[model samples]
Every structure is written in structure tokens, then in C-alpha cells.
Target chain A: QINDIDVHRITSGQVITDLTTAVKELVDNSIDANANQIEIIFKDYGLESIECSDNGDGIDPSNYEFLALKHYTSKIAKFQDVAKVQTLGFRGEALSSLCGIAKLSVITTTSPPKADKLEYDMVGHITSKTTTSRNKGTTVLVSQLFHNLPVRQKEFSKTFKRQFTKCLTVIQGYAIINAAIKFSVWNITPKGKKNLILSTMRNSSMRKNISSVFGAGGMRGLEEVDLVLDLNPFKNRMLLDLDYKIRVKGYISQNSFGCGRNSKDRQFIYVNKRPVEYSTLLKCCNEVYKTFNNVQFPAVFLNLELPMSLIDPDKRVILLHNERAVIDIFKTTLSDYYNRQELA
Target chain B: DVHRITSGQVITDLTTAVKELVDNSIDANANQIEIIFKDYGLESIECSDNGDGIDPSNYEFLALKHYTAKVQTLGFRGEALSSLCGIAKLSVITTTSPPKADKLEYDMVGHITSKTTTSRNKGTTVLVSQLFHNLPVRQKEFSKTFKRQFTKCLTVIQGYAIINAAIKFSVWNITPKGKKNLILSTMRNSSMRKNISSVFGAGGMRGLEEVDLVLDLNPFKNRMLDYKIRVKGYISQNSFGCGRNSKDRQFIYVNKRPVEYSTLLKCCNEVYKTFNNVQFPAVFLNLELPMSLIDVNVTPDKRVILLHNERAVIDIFKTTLSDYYNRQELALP
Candidate 1:
């Protein structure tokens, strides 16, 4: 007779805790909406509130009711959509999970007549809805985070500074991959004053984006490497897909500026525009770094693209951990570059 | 929908499937975990645990997603059962002291097609049949291993056995002709050191010394970020050495939960480098920290965590290990 539904809280409560993951989910949603310009703001290091405004195709008035409901998303309609999934927010659980843990509100308008604004509570129930005048995009405001979980709020508040720093790093990562998108971040005080943490306008090239995110000092002494390997020679391999296509483009830090004490401080890899944890690919970069007399780890920003059929995304156990084919190609290509440089 | 949902996310091979079940059993506080496989887990995989069985009232939602009684356990997502059901048929027979034993059978779609009264000891037995039968391609891929795969599965089971030495773990494989082959048989009530000595053999556990690390900060006196941290485990003596890639011999546990922490691994490797050898030493690190400071959900597989005060912790670890090695060397003369 005294059964409780405490388990329900953990599903969404554990989904987001720190500022980085919460901001990441929202930023991913904005990116999925084809946003070219996004502005992110945090109040009291995101312990008070987080606001994200984007200039993208916003939500429709008809679907406003189910905006914060779980398992409701416009990204994917069927199971087959996951195969060639180009968008990042396919699970449709991010907004709903955010709603479950925090007070959430959104103002959006696809057309010019009026923007629809709706406020939701922790349980996803709408508290208010109104029509407001706004631009053709979406703005989401999240506050009273972890209202239901006291432990999480305490833990987050204790290290809000570090959490805020991680959030900016994640945003910078997105900015590096999406060079065409303009992004800005701000930190708000208790008195409602805002301080700009980072601001980046649309960039013409990845190098420019790097300069904006990491600054000119960080971008100095970097070499751009282009890799367009033909997989036709390795077509007979069992791991290689029949129509395999491999392309890698990135900038690496040379001997003087690139050397680091640890790989975590320098190496960055993005697969199909999404940041992933691939040790083997990073190992390939390290293999080249070893040629520099093992003084320091090489700083890198590599973007790798491959066919959807070539790798299994749904297989979480082996998705990034055991990607042997991609690792082999990258190692071979980078080693060739190293050999050529050594001979010359 | 079934194919999309279960495609490669949960269980990759028979070994992983066995690992999940063993984890569930350990989470259930099972003092005795018995694993039985038929034809290298190709035909069937069964695990029985003498732990707190499922309550009859919660049987309906037990196999459902997001329904769990133990959040602190390793398999908290509650997706393991549904994922298992998507690829194979599952049957569970459980008894929870007060209630009589009951059995439930689920089809590939996770629908409970049959429920009946049954009798069993105060525990639970989970049986997975027709492993990957619905997915022919997966079944074929999983078919290649009978000897090597079984060895891998045994390695996983024994690894758990070493980490959780308080529990008795046994494994047996039933041949195609129905003859049972005995594998690991760790005794119950064995100490972790005994388990290590038994599992890895005396050669692997010899010349090991116990190391204890304790840090306690009172909340009222210390800052909010400061919390209690404790580590107690075994490390190989300076004399003990192995091959260059003996990193596999090193095991790290945080809060009694076995996890991989690169910081601790690197710290151990660095400490080993002080000796005049290009080899690694065996280490078993069991670190404990306040739950508030540890965030386990940073990764999807729960293999890693976002730890607070990592630099300070690793610094203390390196200094203590180096001091231990130096003191031992001074006493040698």
C-alpha cells in the first residue's frame, strides 16, 4: 500500500546534472533545427538559469502541447531513420528529460504572425502559454534545475565554476565543428547582469573558427592535413563495406606548440560532426606524435566522415571502442605522411 | 521496431550477455552465483543466484524498462531484460521468502506470454534460450566461438569473482551430448587475497603487500568540496615484475564497483617505472569516495566517472606508492 514511484525521477534526474551536459543537449537540439546562429546564457554559472536562443526553424504551434512530453520528437518517425541518422537529437528525450528535472519554457515562431511562448514545470505540466512577438527562431529558458533532486543541486553548486568551464568547452567544440554557425555565451550574475564568456561570428574556414575558439596563440604553429584515402584497394577486407568512403581533414600542432603532457590536453576527434570517444583513432595521431621523439602529444582537430552502413551506431558496446577498419585506414594514412616528411 | 531497438546496443556477444546477467546477480546481493552455459552459450545461457528474489507484486514491471528497485546497482537502466527479450526468449523463476515461487516466460517482443506457479529455493534463476534466434546474422556472428569464447566468458566471471570474493561463483558448460564440463569453482567465504591467489595462481599473487589509504574530512570543519576518501587494496612488491604489457594484471575498483580509471592506471604505471625494469607490477586498487562527489552517469556504459579533486587524489596515490617502494627497498639490506 505504500509503494512509491521514486524510480521515475532517476530516469530523467540522472540524464542531466552538470551545466555541460544540459547545455550540450539543448545546443544539440538547436543544431538539429538547422540553426546558423545561437546565443547561450547562464545565470550564476548555470545554477540559477540557462537560456539558449537560436535562429533556426522553430516549433509549430500545433505541436506546442507535446513539446515537453517524453518520447515525442520530430527528428525521427520510424526505426529505419536511425540507420542514416544525420541529426544529433534522435531519441527525442532531451527536452522531455530537461523538463522532468527543471522548470522549462520556450518561445518559438516559424512564421511571422506571432511567437508562441509556453512555460512548463518539473513534471512537464504546462503552467502558462501566451503569444509574443519574436524573431523566426527558438529561445529556451531552463531554471530551478534539479529542483526535485536536492543531492544533485548541492553537488552541482559546490563545483559550479568547473561545471561552467566545461560547458564553455563543449560549446567551443560544437563551434569548431560547425564553422558556419555563429555562437555566443554569457554568464549572468545574481543581479541580472550578463558577462560575455565567449563570442564567435560565422567563420569562412575551420582555421578561423579555431582562432576564435582557441585564440591566435593556440592556433599558431599548426599544420593542416588533408586525407582522402581510396578504400577500393582494401575492398576485399571483411570489415570494409562494399561502398566504403573515407575522408579526413584536420589541423595538427607541430613540434613546438603541439607537444602536451597528456593526450587529453590536445587531441580532439569529431566523427560526422559529433564528438566521440575513439581511442584507436587518437592512437593513430599519437603514432605520428611518437615520430617527434616522444616529447609531447600532438594537438589535433580531426573530422572524419564515413558511410553509415560501414559502422554500427546502435551497438554501444563496440561502436567507438572496436572500430578497427577506420582505425587502420587512419593509421596507415598518417604514417605515410610521417614517412614522407621524414624523407624530405 | 524490435530490430531497431535491440540492434547492437545491449549485448554484442555471448560473453557480454553473460557479463550482464552476472552483474545483475551480484547487484542482487547474491552470496552464491552459478553460471551454466549450453554449447558455449550459443544454445542457452542460464544464471542462478541465491539472493533476494523478486517480489510477486513487482513481477509485471520487473522486465519492463525504467522499472528497478535498486538504483545503486550496476544495471540500473532496467533495459537489460527488455534488450535480452528482443533477441531471445527469456524465462525467470524466482522466490522471495514470503511468497511461493513463480515462473514467467517472455517472448522475443518482451511480452509475458506465460506465467505459472513454481517451486524454487529462496533465490532467482534467469534462463535465456534461443540466443539471437530472431537475428540470424547476429547468431551466425556469435557462432564462431565455442572454446575461445567460453574462455573469455570464464575470464569475465572469474574477474568478478576476484573482485567480489565474498560471494561464491561457479561455472559449468554442458556439451552438445549433455555432459557437463566443470570450469571455475571458487569457494564461498574466501577473502579477496585468497581469491586473487586462487584465481591468478600463487605466481601471480606472490610478493604482494597490502596498502591502505584513508582520508576523512569533517563536513563542519572542511570546505564543501572536501569529502571522505578511502582506498585499501593489494600491490605487488618491488621484487615482483612481469612482461611489459602486464597492465591487465592491474584492477581498480571505486566504491566497491569495478571501473576503469585511466588516472589510477597511469599512476600505477608511473610508480612501476621507478624500478629498474621495463615491466609492470600487479596492482589491485579499491578506492572509496563520498557518493556526492562521484558522478557515475558520465558515460553510457558506466565504465567511467567525473571525479572531483582528481589531481589531489592521484598526487596522494603516487606519493604513497613511491614511499612504500622506497621503504621496502631500504629494509631489504
Candidate 2:
């Protein structure tokens, strides 16, 4: 039984800006746990509190001990597994990271007494013992973030309104990627003025997500470039192929979406339902506008699949959906489709 | 990323790059395509393909887009091979008559030399060289990684041949041994795996597995049955199975055929984690996912998405392998 809590006032060397990134990490966990609903509520002065509720199968209080460890992860983490790529969150550092810089409370429940609800605040400090709960899911709350870490709090600056806005946009992109989930957010700041209430996507698939984020009328003009490439091992049964077809289904602004602040004008891409940022994809966007003779960011939605390993993790595609190499490859593909336009 | 062209040369820019000429080739029902990258210090890099040749009279118009003869009107975009006109030199050769046609022998061969008359083959052979020759800076980028970029052309062809196994592919590095420039005769009636074995060898065929998944949905025109496989030709697996070393695997195709993307191959390796990092079995995997849920259009290039059925397909592969590997390892080990 470990008694001391692993806490840091201000990350000795790690500089954290506002709690936006921390909050995103937690949200990623909630989704990976198979939660169909994720909500974020942020308050000012001290991050009064943040909550995430999900309908996914909750953890059994019995595993509370495992949940308290400094480095804990719930997803597959071996080299082979990481390469194939499954759950977006595998290091399991989301919770630990939040607790490291703030005071946190977790109220989660599974089912029968064998699987009771669990409540913990700050460290493994069980303010409330495991008890019978009505819900079959879990709810996690974090509060007084960096309150103990005065130095960290000061570093974030009293003005974090802009930072929070950026975080909200990140989650919004996630909402667009996983339309099947119901995601909502609330920001409470005494001196801040940013209120965003996005409706849950009513569509069942990602195509609808594209239409919603990009536009139905706009998505209509998108073309299809289906392909299938397969590879076989001689006398060997290893069947491999970069042979799946994907549709670049989204709005292409024939004109560029002006840069700066209006970043929404850029193209958005999705791989396996999850939206990703790729440089190659953007290059494709740039070429798509080659015939327009105008300066505006082109909006695009494309689906791509191959062995996940080909993707460069160095691309750092997460909460945000803009990766370079991926964008470049897609851009080349787009150039192929737009070729016919060069004539007329 | 490093597509090497030549070591030292004044690089230039291509006013327009033609990424896919296979569409017309496919339309002509021509199964084979060869992309030749020639380096002439003065002229642009020329690229050529064998397909249903165009009429000599239309040679001047080939550069124009929306010039296709295929019937149908969805505001069908015009052909853009003409986009290369301003930046590079171009030429087209064709003889619609069969090579064995008794109609003309030497007559047809010489006719091919004419603006339109051609007889050596039943299709057309288009030659495009001096890519991005006008923009020196852009041309310089070729030196930074032209060989690799040129290989991308091969990758594209490999993808094309995988989907259209009926076609035969061959690349002749006019520079000789510039790279693997041999004929690739893909099988018209063989499985994708068989094709890999024929190309890379028996080692490429060993340790084979498959990923087959399906999803059904409409509006996005969906429903996909994906069959994927992985195998190790001759690599040995360490005791620690599902980790980094396990991913050091290479991919191969039958009959000298090839598969370009490796991400999906990693996905296959991912499913076998239950086997433990210590006991990862080497494998060659063939994934045959149905065409619907996944956008078939993404094929022009391996970058695309499934608009409607995302979760179902992803989860299907994840869970299927999780269970399969769990069962296989539990029983075997």
C-alpha cells in the first residue's frame, strides 16, 4: 500500500499552458474507454472543476489500486501493437498527468458490489468509499488544478481565455470525427467571454460528419478515386496490399480559406474515422486550387487506409487535425483527380 | 520521401504534373502500363505509357482537359495530359490494329512513326519527359530525392496492377539498371498473395495470415469485406513477441507484384499481441477488405476514407484479431 501522493507544484521543467491540453488528455481516455458521451466543463481563476461522463463500461472499484499508479495505461503498448495502432491513448498518462498538476476526483462505477462505484480525490485519497451506485458507467472530476503548484499556476498566466478557446476547437474536431458520440463543452470564466454550444451530430457515419463540418452542398462536388492494390508472397501466404480505396469527400473551396484566425478555411482529413492533420493532405489542397487563381484555403475530407505503420508518428496528429506528410500524399492524389480540370 | 532523379543537374519546375494517366489506360481496357523516367540535361524527363493510342490529328489536343471520348456527362472533367505542354516535350505513338493482324506488318510499324499511323501494337504508347523542367528550383528538389520520387511512380503502378491483376507492367530505366526495370506480369486469375510470392520469392510467402472484415451501410455507398494478410519471408522472431522487433518485418507480393503502403500491414501485426512480444510468429498478410464502406475512389492514391461506416469497420478488425490471436496463442503455446 503506497501512502504518499506523486504531486508537483509546477512541473519542474515541463511548462503547461492553461489546462486545455490536460483536459484533452482526459477526454481522449473517456473516448478510448468506449464512452459514447464526453462533456467538458471548465471554470476560471482555478479550474473550479472539470467533469467527463461516459456510458461505456465503467471500471470496477476493485481495480482502484491499479488506477492510482504513477504510470498507468489501459491500452496495448508493445512495439508490435503500437505499430499497428489501435487506441489513441496507450501510455495511460492522462489521469496521472492531470493529478500531477492539480487536485482530482474520480467517481466511477461498473455493476454489482463486486464492481462498485469508486470515488477518489487528489491522490488515491478516497474521500468517499466504494458504494452502490445507480449508473452502470463512470464520471471523473478534476479540481483545484495547479492550486498547490503555485509556480505552475502563475506560469499559465491569469489570461487563459485564448488558450481555452484553442482547446475547445480541438474537442470540436473530435466531435466531428466521432459523430456517433454526444460531446458537449461548457466554459465558466469570470472575465472570459467564450461560449460554444455545438449540437451532437445526428448522422450515423463519418460522411455526415464531413457534410456537417464542411457542408453538404459543398461536399457534393467532391469526386471518387477508388483503388485496390494487393501483394502476395510467392509460395508464402502473407497477403499484403496497399489496396484499399478511399473517397476525398468534403468541400473544396475552389478558393483558399484565408490564413490567420480563420484557420477553419483549411481542409480536414480523416483516417479510419479519426480525423488527422497531415502536410501531404494540405499540399493536395493547395494543388486542388491550382486552377482557381484565387487565394483561399480549400476544404477537403478524405478517408485513407493502409498499414498504419506507414504513417509517421513524428507527424504528431492528435486533438488537432493537421499533419504534414499525410497531407502531401493526399495532395498528390488530389492533383491526379484535378488533372482533368487543367484542360477546360 | 527521398525519390532520387539524378545527382547533379540544374533542376527545374514542371508547369503541370500528370499524376494519373491510368484512367485512360483503364478506360481503353489496357491492363499494362509502364512509366519511364528519362534524364536529358536539356529536355524534360519524359514519361510514357502503352494504351489505346490517340489519333494523330488529336495529338495537338491531348494537352487539353475534358477531351476524353468516354460517353457520360457528370460534367466529366477534360483530360489534362496537355497540362504538360508548356513545361515539357511530349510525343504519342499508337497502332490500334492487333500486333498479329494480317492487315499490315512493316506498313503498320512505319505508320506508327507518322503523326497517327501505327501498327506494332494494338494500343497507344505515350512518351512524357522533362517533368517540371521549366522551374529550375522545383527541378532541383528532384536531386534532393528524385530516385525515391521516381520509385513512387513504381509504387503507383504496383497499386494499379494489384487492383487490375489482368494487366502486365514493365519499367525500362532508359538509363539501364538505374533501378529494377523489368517486366512485371501480374496474374489475371491468381490471388493477390500468389502474386507476391511470384515476385519476392518463397520467403515472401511464408508466415502468412489474413484480416477479413465487413460493414454494411448506405448513402455513402457502403459495405466492405476486407481480407488482409502478413508473413515473414525468412526473418526470425525474438521471444518478446508483440513489440518493436516484431514490426521489423518486410512485405512481399506474388509473381513479382508489390504492395506499397505499410500502415495496414502493421495493423495485422497489432492484432497478434496476445501472442506475447516473446513469441511473435513471422508472417505475410493479405488484407481483402470489401470496397463499399471504404471509399474505392481512394485507390487512385492510397489516401482516402469511409464516409459512413467508420466505427463498424475499425472495430471489426480490432476485435476480430484480438479474439483470433488470443485463441491461437492460448492453444498453441
Candidate 3:
């Protein structure tokens, strides 16, 4: 049977799978909106609700009707803009997806005029809107997480304790990568006791951001890294131009027991300043790290700045573009650098 | 800032294209399916199935995204057809208990306003052509390395063939010279071992044995583990050089749905290595658990699966393999 539009909205991969994903998408939207100051509040370990506040270009009052509607967004102007979009929330369905599973409320302002505190229904239609006042920013409040999704709600309730830890790790990744932004995360317990889990300053570097998230030891044994990779060799092979360079930069723990974690959990990778899973990159780096460190994994914090044009935003994996060769070169360069440092 | 971010879900590559078509065929209860790849999938591909063809009434919603015939009975997003129609030239010829079939044509956005009647059997044939023609980069890649994508597509069919042995699945490729190559063919068989043998070569069945084990467990180690799960399928016998060099041959199906269960595979390999000298055992194990305990919506591909009691399932998998090996070899009185 042809399902209703509501059923389609819920089934269209728009629904957030966990508290971590919901928080991540909201933060992504805030960052994409050019927010300099962003705060995430988890009420009752993200079961009851999650609230994200950001000081950025607020939502256009004109778009209020289409704001949270499925596939409606201001992020993209046209179809081909996905190739050039610099924002992370280009999917445009995250807000709508959140509405399908939970109750969503929003407040924002562009002009110094009164802001609108908007209420959204299950299918992302604005149920109600009240004129309110706020600074030039947008604040999205997602309450009763997975209230409509009974299955997901039960599972989230059952595994929420573990999910909160994962949720913290995801926020930590964003906090460290977006070092220039002011980011803070707070957890509100059922007892009404609230505490800051992470708080980062505005004037900061990647090292400082890591320290703020993982405590002092996060940067203890880390060594600075800045390597420029020439993509001209494979530019034509990948149908890319020599106009841009692939820069691999960040910190890796030296050959010492200092601040290295017991597992590979401490490793982080950001491509073009966006935190995404880099399993192959981690696997390759670890294969080299094992040559020297042997036992414990390194505190690897790396970022790859690719030619933005070649990146397909929706596809998470970058295993193409002769990526293996680039990573292989990275491995060799790191190995040779380590060899020279050890000799010295 | 809103431009269409490329959807990673639909028709990502040649492999996915073929997989989606084959899935539709199987989903329609096709007993006999034929897959034809023209010019090694650079030119076109078609899947003909003797399944319950599309009803003329459902033709309008059939090509539209987010519309499906079944919900919990299947996990496929009705999006595949619509998304494919948007990227490539997609047309379906089908008949459902009618004397003639309809050749439905879909526009770029999956709107079907035109149709013509044609004589056909009670079946469906979905033909996709000029795939990725708009995307120059993707086309160039396909032109250069069609074999890589062809191999990936074969693996997808092989997994389905293993699980559905009673169904006949055949794959063929044709060159511009019109030379037809039988890539893989499997006939109807009661034992899934024969299907595996036919696809991977007859020698594959030598070390394989039919296995059916019910893992009934009480609460163990700290959590509530009161679950009775059924693990059934084929596994290789523990003998000299019995395992494959890699774990590529291990196919794990959950409730008859072929899924990528790497953690369960890794656990089974670890346990097998403890008992046998093989590097990795080849097993086509199907794990049956409650539908409520399984979440197939974990990824857009639906290949990434999440179990409710993941830790418990892994523990049971490890214990089952350990017990299976314990009963093997010699016993003395």
C-alpha cells in the first residue's frame, strides 16, 4: 500500500538513530549556520530532551513554514550546489527527521525585531508560533526524544547509559576539531543536578581544545604535524586539477607512554575540519605506529584538507581518488620522519 | 546554502544498481531470476524475474520514492526504483494475472504518465541503461574498471543464491562481440550446499557440513540473557588446511536477510582458530532472533545491522562455535 507522507518521513532515513546522532545533527546545523558560540544541553541524559543554542545567522522568518519540512533547507540553493556547499547540514532533512521522532521547538531572530518561538508537529509542520525576543541566533529544543518511535524509545531508554558515553565522544570530536569556536556541553541529571562535561574557549588551538576535552594528558606526548601533499601527480588520474593541495595536519603522540590511551578510542580524524569516521586512515596510521610503539596505540589527531571539489559530501568514505596512494605516502613520510628523529 | 547533497543511498555504483534490482526480484517471490549485464555493465543491465509482477493499479506509486508494498515484511526503501529512475533510464515490463503486460516508462523524477501494452508472461523485467551518463567522473571510472564493479555485483548475487537455494538465480555478461559469459549460475536445490557448490565450484562442498544449533541460554555474566536463538546453515569441517586464506567466504544472514555481521564473523573466526589450525573457517550461518531485537534501519544501505542484545548475541555465537568444535574429532571411553 502507498503509505502516508508521515510514514514516509519516518522511514526515509530522516529519523535520528540515537541521542548522539540527534545532538550531532543539531550541532552540525549550528556550525553550518556560521555559529561562533554554541552550547548543547542534554536534559536527563538526552532521554527527556536536548537543547542546542548558537549565535549565528538566525533563520529567516519567511522560511518558518518550510524550515523543518522534509527536504526543505536554506543550505543549498540548487541541485548542483551540493558540490560546492561548505556547510555540514546540506541534507536538509535532519530537522524534519527529528520532528518525526520527537517534539521540536525553535526560537531565532535575524533582525533586532522580536524572534519567533516556533512549535513543530510530527511531520515537521509548524503547529504554533509565538513572537519572542532573542539575539541574532537560533536555538532548537528537541524534547521527548523518540516519543513517537516506541521501539527506538524503549531501546534508547534501555541503552541510554552507554549511548550517553558515545554521545560525549561525538561532542568531544566536534569540540576538538572546531577549536576556533566557543563550544560547551552540559548534562542535566534526573536529580536536577547540572554539570559541564566540556567547555572550550574562543581563542584556542587544536592542542588546547584536546586538552579541554580530555583533560591535561590529552596533549602531553603529542607532537605537532604539518605536511603538505602534492596532488598534481594524481590530479589528472582523479580528474581533479592542480589548483589545490591536500594538506595532512595534526598531532600524533610520540614514542612514549605519556598520554597515549590503552585503546584506539583516543584517535580522531577530521577531513576539511569536519569530524568523520576514518577507519582506513586509522588502520594505516596504526600499522605504522605498531612498528615503534608495538603495544599501545598512539593519540593520533589528524586532519586531511582535500580539494573540496572532489569530495562527495553525502558519501562518508573517501576510499577513492587514489586515496590509498595518498595515505600510503603519508605512512611512508611519518615512518621516515620517525626514523630521522630516532637517529637524532 | 541548500543545494542537493548527493544521496549516498541510491544507485551509488554498478554493484548497488544490480543489488537493488535483484532484491526487487527476490522480494516479489521470484523462483527463477536471470541477470544480464551488457558490455560488462558499462552499457546496460537487466534483471528478468518470474515473480509476482507489478499490479497495474500500483504502477503509479511503484516508481515513486518512499512507497512500498510491504513494510515490516521487507526492509527495502521503495526509494531504489525512484532514485534509479532519476539517475538512469528505468523502465519496467510486467504482467500480473493479465493476458498482456504493461511497459511503464518513468520520467526523471519517477512520475509515470505513459504506458504501452505488450504481450508477456506473468513476470517482470527491469531494464536500466545509460547509468551515470550525466556524471562524467563516474562514467570514466566505470569505463576503466567495470570488472571491479562486476565482481562486487557477483558477490551480492552469490549471497542471495546461498540463502535461497530453492530459487534459481543465473548471472550472465555479454561483450560487444556478442559473446555471452556465464558468470555464475545456480539451479534449484533442497540443500543450500549445492547452491554454494554450484556458484563457488563443486569442490566447495567437500569440507562443508549442514549445521543446525539452537542456542538456549539463561542469564549469564551480569545481564539478562534469557534468549533462545536458532543458528542454522553450513560450516566447514575442522581439518588440515580447511579454512580459506581470507574471511571473504563467510556469509552471515539474520532472519534470512543477508547482512554484513563483521563482529559475529570475527568472533567465530577467533573461536575457530582456537580449535583448528585454519586461518578462517567458511560458514554460511543464519542467525534467527526476534524481529523486535533486530534493527535493520541502522544504515541507508540496510546492510549495517544492529542487534538489541549485541553483547549477548556475540557471546552466544562464540559459545556455539566452541561447542560445535568440541563435539568434533575423536572421543575415547
Highest TM-score, which number?
3
Rate residue B323 of model 2 by lDDT: 63
lDDT of each: 0.70, 0.46, 0.74
Q: Which pairs in model 3 have colliding backbones?
A: A74-B2, A75-B1, A75-B2, A76-B1, A76-B2, A76-B3, A77-B2
TM-scores for all predictions: 0.47, 0.39, 0.47
Residue-level lDDT of model 2, residues B9-76, one tens digit each, is: 21122212324355455555576665555442223333334565543333322333211101011111
Best by lDDT: 3
Candidate 2 lDDT over residue span A221-273, tens digit each = 34444533222111122345543333444334433223111133335566666
Encode model 3's per-residue lDDT on B139-188: one tens digit a residue: 78888888777777788788988788768988999988889999888887
- What would the per-residue lDDT of candidate 1 be over residues B35-134, giving only the tens digit for each residue? 8988878889999999988766445435544211002222233367766877777899998773478889865544456788978778899998877776
Worst 10 residues of 3 chain B by lDDT: B65-74
- lDDT of predicted model 1: 0.70
lDDT of 3: 0.74
- Measured against the native two-chain assembly using Cα atoms, what DockQ does each of the candidate structures obtain, in the order listed? 0.01, 0.01, 0.01
Candidate 3 — which residues are off by over 4 angstroms?
A1-344, B1-8, B66-77, B217-226, B276-278, B331-333
Interface RMSD of each: 21.7, 24.5, 22.2
Q: Which lDDT tens digits does candidate 1 get at residues A174-279? A: 8777877888876655532244556666754767777656533345557787898656556444553365666888787654433333334546677787767667
Model 2 sits at a Cα RMSD from the real structure of 28.0
